Amino acid sequence: GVVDILKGAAKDIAGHLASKVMN
């Protein structure tokens, strides 16, 4: 599943920004 973390880590950044906006 380590492969999911490498590509997911980046994609997570994009989804993270949305969080800040939601706050």
Side-chain angles (χ1 to χ4, degrees):
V2 189
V3 180
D4 186 275
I5 295 172
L6 94 77
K7 55 222 297 199
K11 266 176 86 66
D12 186 273
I13 298 170
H16 207 42
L17 174 55
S19 115
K20 335 287 160 43
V21 180
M22 289 165 60
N23 281 257

Short mmCIF file of all heavy atoms in Angstrom, two decimals:
data_model
loop_
_atom_site.label_atom_id
_atom_site.label_comp_id
_atom_site.label_asym_id
_atom_site.label_seq_id
_atom_site.Cartn_x
_atom_site.Cartn_y
_atom_site.Cartn_z
N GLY A 1 0.86 -1.22 0.00
CA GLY A 1 0.00 0.00 0.00
C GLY A 1 0.88 1.24 0.00
O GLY A 1 0.39 2.36 -0.13
N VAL A 2 2.18 1.04 0.15
CA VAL A 2 3.12 2.16 0.17
C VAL A 2 2.99 2.99 -1.10
O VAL A 2 3.23 4.20 -1.09
CB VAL A 2 4.56 1.63 0.29
CG1 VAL A 2 5.51 2.80 0.52
CG2 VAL A 2 4.64 0.66 1.47
N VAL A 3 2.61 2.33 -2.19
CA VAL A 3 2.46 3.02 -3.47
C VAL A 3 1.33 4.04 -3.40
O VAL A 3 1.39 5.10 -4.02
CB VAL A 3 2.16 2.01 -4.57
CG1 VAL A 3 1.99 2.74 -5.91
CG2 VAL A 3 3.32 1.02 -4.68
N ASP A 4 0.29 3.72 -2.64
CA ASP A 4 -0.86 4.62 -2.50
C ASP A 4 -0.48 5.87 -1.72
O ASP A 4 -1.06 6.94 -1.93
CB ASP A 4 -2.00 3.89 -1.79
CG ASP A 4 -3.25 4.77 -1.77
OD1 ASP A 4 -3.35 5.59 -0.88
OD2 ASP A 4 -4.07 4.61 -2.66
N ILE A 5 0.46 5.73 -0.80
CA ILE A 5 0.89 6.86 0.02
C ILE A 5 1.74 7.85 -0.76
O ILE A 5 1.69 9.06 -0.51
CB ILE A 5 1.67 6.36 1.23
CG1 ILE A 5 0.74 5.53 2.13
CG2 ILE A 5 2.21 7.55 2.02
CD1 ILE A 5 1.56 4.85 3.23
N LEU A 6 2.54 7.35 -1.69
CA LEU A 6 3.41 8.21 -2.48
C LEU A 6 2.59 9.11 -3.41
O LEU A 6 2.80 10.33 -3.44
CB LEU A 6 4.43 7.36 -3.25
CG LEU A 6 3.95 7.04 -4.67
CD1 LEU A 6 4.13 8.26 -5.59
CD2 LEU A 6 4.77 5.87 -5.23
N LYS A 7 1.67 8.53 -4.17
CA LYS A 7 0.84 9.30 -5.07
C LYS A 7 -0.28 10.00 -4.32
O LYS A 7 -0.74 11.07 -4.73
CB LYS A 7 0.27 8.38 -6.14
CG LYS A 7 -0.49 7.22 -5.48
CD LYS A 7 -0.17 5.91 -6.20
CE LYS A 7 -0.67 5.98 -7.65
NZ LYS A 7 -0.77 4.60 -8.20
N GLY A 8 -0.72 9.40 -3.22
CA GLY A 8 -1.80 9.98 -2.42
C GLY A 8 -1.30 11.18 -1.63
O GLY A 8 -2.06 12.12 -1.37
N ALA A 9 -0.03 11.16 -1.25
CA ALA A 9 0.55 12.25 -0.48
C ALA A 9 0.38 13.57 -1.22
O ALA A 9 -0.03 14.58 -0.63
CB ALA A 9 2.04 11.99 -0.24
N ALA A 10 0.69 13.57 -2.51
CA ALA A 10 0.56 14.77 -3.32
C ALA A 10 -0.90 15.17 -3.47
O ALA A 10 -1.28 16.30 -3.17
CB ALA A 10 1.18 14.54 -4.70
N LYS A 11 -1.72 14.24 -3.94
CA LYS A 11 -3.13 14.50 -4.13
C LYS A 11 -3.76 15.01 -2.84
O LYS A 11 -4.69 15.81 -2.86
CB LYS A 11 -3.83 13.21 -4.58
CG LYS A 11 -3.91 13.16 -6.11
CD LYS A 11 -4.51 11.83 -6.56
CE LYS A 11 -6.04 11.93 -6.56
NZ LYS A 11 -6.48 12.90 -7.61
N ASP A 12 -3.23 14.54 -1.72
CA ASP A 12 -3.73 14.95 -0.42
C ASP A 12 -3.55 16.45 -0.22
O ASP A 12 -4.41 17.12 0.35
CB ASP A 12 -2.99 14.19 0.69
CG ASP A 12 -3.62 14.50 2.04
OD1 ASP A 12 -3.23 15.49 2.65
OD2 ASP A 12 -4.49 13.75 2.46
N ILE A 13 -2.43 16.97 -0.70
CA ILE A 13 -2.15 18.40 -0.58
C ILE A 13 -3.28 19.22 -1.18
O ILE A 13 -3.76 20.18 -0.58
CB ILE A 13 -0.83 18.74 -1.28
CG1 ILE A 13 0.32 17.98 -0.61
CG2 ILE A 13 -0.58 20.25 -1.17
CD1 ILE A 13 1.58 18.13 -1.45
N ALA A 14 -3.70 18.83 -2.38
CA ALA A 14 -4.78 19.53 -3.07
C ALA A 14 -6.07 19.47 -2.25
O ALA A 14 -6.76 20.47 -2.09
CB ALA A 14 -5.02 18.91 -4.44
N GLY A 15 -6.37 18.29 -1.73
CA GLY A 15 -7.58 18.10 -0.92
C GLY A 15 -7.45 18.83 0.41
O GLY A 15 -8.46 19.20 1.02
N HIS A 16 -6.22 19.03 0.86
CA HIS A 16 -5.98 19.72 2.12
C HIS A 16 -6.33 21.19 2.00
O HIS A 16 -7.00 21.75 2.87
CB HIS A 16 -4.51 19.57 2.51
CG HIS A 16 -4.37 19.65 4.01
ND1 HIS A 16 -5.25 19.01 4.87
CD2 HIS A 16 -3.46 20.28 4.82
CE1 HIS A 16 -4.86 19.27 6.13
NE2 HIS A 16 -3.77 20.04 6.15
N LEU A 17 -5.89 21.82 0.92
CA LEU A 17 -6.17 23.23 0.70
C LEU A 17 -7.66 23.50 0.83
O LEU A 17 -8.08 24.51 1.39
CB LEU A 17 -5.68 23.65 -0.69
CG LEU A 17 -6.11 25.09 -0.99
CD1 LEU A 17 -5.62 26.03 0.12
CD2 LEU A 17 -5.51 25.53 -2.33
N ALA A 18 -8.47 22.58 0.30
CA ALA A 18 -9.91 22.72 0.37
C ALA A 18 -10.37 22.78 1.82
O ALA A 18 -11.29 23.52 2.17
CB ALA A 18 -10.59 21.55 -0.33
N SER A 19 -9.71 22.00 2.67
CA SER A 19 -10.05 21.98 4.09
C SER A 19 -9.92 23.37 4.69
O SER A 19 -10.84 23.88 5.33
CB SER A 19 -9.14 21.00 4.83
OG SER A 19 -8.32 21.71 5.75
N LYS A 20 -8.76 23.99 4.49
CA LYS A 20 -8.52 25.33 5.02
C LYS A 20 -9.64 26.27 4.60
O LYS A 20 -10.13 27.07 5.41
CB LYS A 20 -7.18 25.85 4.50
CG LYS A 20 -6.26 24.68 4.15
CD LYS A 20 -5.77 24.04 5.44
CE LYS A 20 -5.28 22.62 5.16
NZ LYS A 20 -4.47 22.61 3.91
N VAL A 21 -10.05 26.17 3.34
CA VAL A 21 -11.12 27.02 2.83
C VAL A 21 -12.43 26.73 3.55
O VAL A 21 -13.22 27.63 3.82
CB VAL A 21 -11.30 26.78 1.33
CG1 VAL A 21 -12.43 27.67 0.80
CG2 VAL A 21 -10.00 27.13 0.60
N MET A 22 -12.65 25.46 3.87
CA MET A 22 -13.87 25.06 4.57
C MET A 22 -13.89 25.62 5.98
O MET A 22 -14.91 26.15 6.43
CB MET A 22 -13.97 23.53 4.62
CG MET A 22 -14.27 22.99 3.22
SD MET A 22 -13.96 21.20 3.19
CE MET A 22 -15.15 20.74 4.47
N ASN A 23 -12.77 25.49 6.68
CA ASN A 23 -12.67 25.99 8.05
C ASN A 23 -13.34 27.36 8.17
O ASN A 23 -14.16 27.58 9.07
CB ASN A 23 -11.20 26.11 8.45
CG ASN A 23 -10.66 24.73 8.84
OD1 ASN A 23 -10.50 24.44 10.02
ND2 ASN A 23 -10.35 23.87 7.90
#
